[PDB]
Design a protein around this ligand. Structure first.
Ligand code: BTN
Ligand code: BTN
Ligand code: BTN
Ligand code: BTN
Lengths: 121, 123, 121, 123
């Protein structure tokens, strides 16, 4: 795959993901979150496994965003792991982990988990 | 800090992580897994939040590895989210998500979750 | 809350969750999965926090299903953690962990994570 | 096995788990957390898969704790999913999900994820 991963996608919270997939598995772009201690665009970097497998499977991929930019520094980073499914309606179905930097004392509650579904709609 | 993160790290499974942290919050390197449908090294890219806080908080970061290289293609990708704690014995504590590409029907069992702790080797 | 948690709910995979909420926080019932190494009904037990909080929040709850019954024994168990939201369309939004029993060697890949949304529709 | 699981267990944070495993695959007991918006004991209910396999596999199980008792109401619930490994030093290795009740708008940050390892105390 790689196919139509490039583009501007949006998730159910109204966040915008603008990405470019390189033919060798790299993903680059920017992220703008509609929620959280975030504002404006953030740099993202990831990878996607091409050469996926005939049995109409999705393409595994993942990316990271460290929430620091020239506007805010939320001392956290999020990683999204999921797969791309194309067709008439293409989607990127993910599960993410958002880790904030804590002291040892609070390390037990440093990580949130959630799921996001992206479309070009 | 970039310097503290740059280096060779190993985790409890015997996997290897070689990374360099750029002043821009970038992370690039290779990962070698001791387990799984993997062989040789794989490229990794990630980011880390460059200006943490003062205090004794960890530095948040995350990176991704798509499990495809010249020797093998597992059709999966793993992302590690965690924090770096420097010091005499520095550690990177993480939780990860491993998604395999599946058909729509099997998408419910596409992701594995786990945690890994990495120890830095001297240098 | 507790309100209308009792009932028969269904999720996006077509699984059926039949539960009874006791006024003291207990949840009891049976589960039938439309997918996996499962067949017929399985016993479930859980808890839900009542006395929830005015700011129209959901009610936190969770439950477990060990996948052994008189038909199959899949040597695994799933726990769903989420919150109930009622109203005209009530839903139970969850994230689950499915752990299978492995040898130490395979312990690194014993746990799957996912999300299910239940409705009475 | 029911007998092996029944007992008092503690985890790395200093929390206490007292449980009894019924021959029907049931688990009942109390949990006391060393951290969080919690105080005193809380009731727990769960299940465990009674007939594991022969082999040196773990026994899968899980339990839930809603964080409400006579002294405090945190409006949250935690579920622990993991496996029991018996032996001279028995352990229960788990991963957990802690969901707080939120408004629809904040539902994206309602769940925390983590892992705990429990060690059995003699008796
Ligand atoms: O608050 C923070 O720490 C920074 C913003 C986090 C926004 C999160 S990342 C996962 C979820 N998906 C989104 O589009 N935004 C939230
Ligand atoms: O089997 C695969 O799909 C590729 C190899 C996965 C190895 C995983 S990623 C998380 C965990 N950490 C490691 O060091 N190895 C395993
Ligand atoms: O295959 C197994 O180990 C037993 C069946 C597991 C079915 C799972 S649990 C989470 C998800 N939600 C469902 O309704 N079914 C699957
Ligand atoms: O703060 C709350 O919402 C209630 C207390 C939560 C304590 C958690 S549950 C997971 C982890 N394991 C423990 O032993 N304590 C923390």
């Amino acid at each position: 795959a790689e196919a139509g991963i490039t583009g501007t996608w949006y998730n159910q919270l109204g966040s915008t993901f603008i990405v470019t997939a390189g033919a060798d598995g790299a993903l680059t772009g920017t992220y703008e979150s509609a929620v959280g201690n975030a504002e404006s665009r953030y740099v993202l970097t990831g990878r996607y496994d091409s050469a996926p497998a005939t049995d109409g499977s999705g393409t595994a991929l993942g990316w990271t965003v460290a929430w620091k930019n020239n506007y805010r520094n939320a001392h956290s980073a999020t990683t999204w792991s999921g797969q791309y499914v194309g067709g008439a309606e293409a989607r990127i179905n993910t599960q993410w982990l958002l880790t904030s930097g804590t002291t040892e004392a609070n390390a037990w509650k440093s990580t949130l988990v959630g799921h996001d579904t992206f479309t070009k709609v």
